[PDB]
Amino acid sequence: ARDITLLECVGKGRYGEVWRGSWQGENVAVKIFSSRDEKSWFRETELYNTVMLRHENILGFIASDMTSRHSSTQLWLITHYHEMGSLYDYLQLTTLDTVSCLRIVLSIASGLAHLHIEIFGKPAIAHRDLKSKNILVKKNGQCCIADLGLAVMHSQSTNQLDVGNNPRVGTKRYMAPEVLDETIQVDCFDSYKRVDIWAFGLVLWEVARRMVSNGIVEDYKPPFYDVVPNDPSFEDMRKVVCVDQQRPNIPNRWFSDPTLTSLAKLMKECWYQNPSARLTALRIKKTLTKID
Amino acid sequence: RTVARDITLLECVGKGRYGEVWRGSWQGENVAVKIFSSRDEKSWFRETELYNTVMLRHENILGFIASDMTSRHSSTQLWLITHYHEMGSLYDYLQLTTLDTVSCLRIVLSIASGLAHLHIEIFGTGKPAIAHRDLKSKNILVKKNGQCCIADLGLAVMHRVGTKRYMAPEVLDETIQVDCFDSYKRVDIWAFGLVLWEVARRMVSNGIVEDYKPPFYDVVPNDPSFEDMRKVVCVDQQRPNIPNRWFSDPTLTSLAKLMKECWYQNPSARLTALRIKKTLTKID
Numbered sequence: 170a171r172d173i174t175l176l177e178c179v180g181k182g183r184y185g186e187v188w189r190g191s192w193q194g195e196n197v198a199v200k201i202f203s204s205r206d207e208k209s210w211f212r213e214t215e216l217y218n219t220v221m222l223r224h225e226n227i228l229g230f231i232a233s234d235m236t237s238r239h240s241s242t243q244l245w246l247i248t249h250y251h252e253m254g255s256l257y258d259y260l261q262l263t264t265l266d267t268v269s270c271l272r273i274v275l276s277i278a279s280g281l282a283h284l285h286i287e288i289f290g291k292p293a294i295a296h297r298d299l300k301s302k303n304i305l306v307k308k309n310g311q312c313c314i315a316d317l318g319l320a321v322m323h324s325q326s327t328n329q330l331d332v333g334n335n336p337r338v339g340t341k342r343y344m345a346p347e348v349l350d351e352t353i354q355v356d357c358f359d360s361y362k363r364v365d366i367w368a369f370g371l372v373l374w375e376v377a378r379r380m381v382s383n384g385i386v387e388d389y390k391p392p393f394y395d396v397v398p399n400d401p402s403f404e405d406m407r408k409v410v411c412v413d414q415q416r417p418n419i420p421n422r423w424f425s426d427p428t429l430t431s432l433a434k435l436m437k438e439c440w441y442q443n444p445s446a447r448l449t450a451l452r453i454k455k456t457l458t459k460i461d
Numbered sequence: 462r463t464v465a466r467d468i469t470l471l472e473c474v475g476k477g478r479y480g481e482v483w484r485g486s487w488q489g490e491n492v493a494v495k496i497f498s499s500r501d502e503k504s505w506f507r508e509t510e511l512y513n514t515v516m517l518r519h520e521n522i523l524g525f526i527a528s529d530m531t532s533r534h535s536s537t538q539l540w541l542i543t544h545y546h547e548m549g550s551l552y553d554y555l556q557l558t559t560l561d562t563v564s565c566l567r568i569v570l571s572i573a574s575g576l577a578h579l580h581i582e583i584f585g586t587g588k589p590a591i592a593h594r595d596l597k598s599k600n601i602l603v604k605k606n607g608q609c610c611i612a613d614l615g616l617a618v619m620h621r622v623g624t625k626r627y628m629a630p631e632v633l634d635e636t637i638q639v640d641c642f643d644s645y646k647r648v649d650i651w652a653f654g655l656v657l658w659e660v661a662r663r664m665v666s667n668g669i670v671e672d673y674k675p676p677f678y679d680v681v682p683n684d685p686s687f688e689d690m691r692k693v694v695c696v697d698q699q700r701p702n703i704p705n706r707w708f709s710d711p712t713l714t715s716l717a718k719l720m721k722e723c724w725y726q727n728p729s730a731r732l733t734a735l736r737i738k739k740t741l742t743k744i745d
């Protein structure tokens with residue numbers, strides 16, 4: 170049984186469209202890529218060829234298709250469906266307790282360490298577009314990382330780095346200093362891992378804002394909401410992150426709560442301008458495993 | 462809307478190291494389904510990457526329908542779906558069938574037409590230049606209208622090794638200029654000249670025809686080694702035999718000349734696919 174029914178559109182953007190569909194009686198997600206993003210479709214397909222990519226905290230792959238008649242091409246990705254939506258959606262109108270906040274951020278750290286660490290198989294993988302819209306929320310209170318169209322792969326045993334062919338760049342709001350100032354070392358796998366760590370720290374901040382302590386919580390805001398225009402340009406982000414050396418502010422109410430005090434320390438160790446000073450994904454996972 | 466993806470696999474029409482090809486049915490319509498071996502996964506990726514870059518559409522190119530990747534419990538399944546040609550490969554067809562002047566010319570001009578379409582860069586939104594890198598009579602299909610189409614872009618390059626029996630001298634002696642796209646066109650032209658020879662042998666003249674044989678059948682073993690081929694093609698500089706009977710027939714006399722000008726040791730002396738088309742249009 171291969172047939173799918175497209176039932177409702179759950180997202181439309183420059184990327185294309187995502188539909189809730191039905192397959193063998195179950196919900197699936199069907200992404201139809203824009204022509205503009207054909208190189209993301211092919212990269213995501215290369216990544217999902219890897220059987221040992223499968224993980225609790227990585228969006229589950231069902232199929233990939235490229236179809237054509239005459240001069241028209243359609244590009245399809247079929248995945249598991251998460252009806253709670255993205256972490257971005259979820260944080261807009263839910264607050265968290267300690268247990269839920271740590272479960273979410275540990276699950277994302279678990280997914281990211283699974284990507285970064287080679288299995289001897291699954292190459293080491295850097296994502297390059299980590300953000301709260303690219304994380305889905307699951308009914309077990311864990312999350313899974315989505316969108317491997319920009320990913321970079323590295324194999325330690327063979328000294329092979331595969332940066333793919335995709336002129337797409339990461340989401341501007343989440344770009345590390347070395348991406349915004351274009352000094353990143355493009356032939357260095359560790360450089361791409363460190364870009365993911367920066368973005369992870371931003372997602373940690375977005376989540377922690379929504380965790381209640383002492384009867385107080387912050388409203389959902391995206392990273393740098395206070396310092397850049399709506400719909401910030403590459404140069405807008407370069408100004409605040411590289412010129413102004415801005416980092417997200419830590420609300421002072423966090424310092425009364427031991428959990429949020431520990432999280433503030435962790436996100437600050439994701440945000441050093443020196444990429445080599447940043448924590449590893451494995452260290453973040455070990456730190457979050459110890460925090461309560 | 463309903464997205465009907467079910468394909469009924471009806472009969473296996475090919476099995477090899479590459480995997481399998483099946484005649485299949487989608488929505489009442491025959492399709493061909495290549496199911497890739499794990500050995501040959503990179504051929505699926507390369508053909509899929511090429512079609513994601515340029516949707517080739519030509520009478521003499523096998524028609525693309527789909528690339529499908531399906532997650533299994535323990536493996537990834539890779540299918541390429543194309544038009545189905547019930548007459549099968551030119552290799553298959555030549556075993557039994559003999560040709561007359563009109564059919565022989567229609568076959569070889571259709572292959573040259575496909576090959577020139579691959580080779581040529583077209584500007585606009587056009588196509589990059591493409592070299593095939595594994596041209597042979599098993600990678601050409603026969604159509605009911607008497608024309609052929611070129612198949613298998615798993616080794617194609619845009620601007621696994623080729624089949625050893627069809628390798629040009631510069632591939633066998635490792636002198637090929639690998640940073641020069643024209644080098645890869647010239648390797649295809651060599652292979653084209655061998656396919657021309659295979660087809661010409663099956664053209665009847667004055668009641669005479671040669672039996673089907675693959676190129677170099679009289680000088681190398683079955684599944685020749687790289688070294689077997691190097692010694693024939695590079696060291697001794699042998700070329701396929703032209704029978705005397707061809708020189709009584711004006712079509713086969715012209716085709717002998719053409720195939721000679723695809724087999725020069727010096728790759729830059731070989732005819733271009735566009736020049737081969739022009740020559741073929743002036744025969745008969």
Ligand SMILES: COc1cc(-c2cncc(-c3ccc(C4CCN(C)CC4)cc3)c2C)cc(OC)c1OC
Nearest residue numbers: 235236237238239241242487488490492525526527
């Ligand atoms: C993959 O292959 C086959 C596909 C199909 C097929 C099935 N549904 C819909 C379509 C379709 C409709 C509309 C557009 C365009 C039209 C103009 N503009 C507005 C953009 C949209 C594109 C595509 C097709 C082509 C049929 C086939 O054979 C009958 C195929 O061949 C096996």
Ligand SMILES: COc1cc(-c2cncc(-c3ccc(C4CCN(C)CC4)cc3)c2C)cc(OC)c1OC
Nearest residue numbers: 179187198199200248250251254255258303315316
């Ligand atoms: C990020 O990337 C991909 C994501 C998905 C995906 C998978 N499950 C569920 C969803 C989803 C469903 C519903 C809502 C919302 C809709 C409106 N409101 C806010 C309530 C609920 C949001 C999101 C998505 C978008 C699939 C993908 O590919 C098939 C993705 O690309 C890799």
Ligand SMILES: COc1cc(-c2cncc(-c3ccc(C4CCN(C)CC4)cc3)c2C)cc(OC)c1OC
Nearest residue numbers: 234236243245463464465466487526527528529542
């Ligand atoms: C995913 O996988 C396979 C799909 C198909 C297939 C089946 N029905 C319809 C389609 C279709 C084509 C094109 C559009 C257009 C129409 C609207 N326009 C504005 C944009 C989109 C819609 C639908 C397809 C592509 C066949 C397959 O096998 C032969 C598939 O598996 C390889």
Ligand SMILES: COc1cc(-c2cncc(-c3ccc(C4CCN(C)CC4)cc3)c2C)cc(OC)c1OC
Nearest residue numbers: 474482493494495541543545546549599600612613
């Ligand atoms: C070289 O490469 C590819 C070829 C094909 C392909 C396309 N049409 C028809 C065929 C075929 C059908 C039927 C017979 C036989 C059946 C028994 N008897 C009656 C003699 C003839 C042979 C061959 C094939 C093999 C598809 C491919 O991919 C999907 C190929 O790979 C790119």
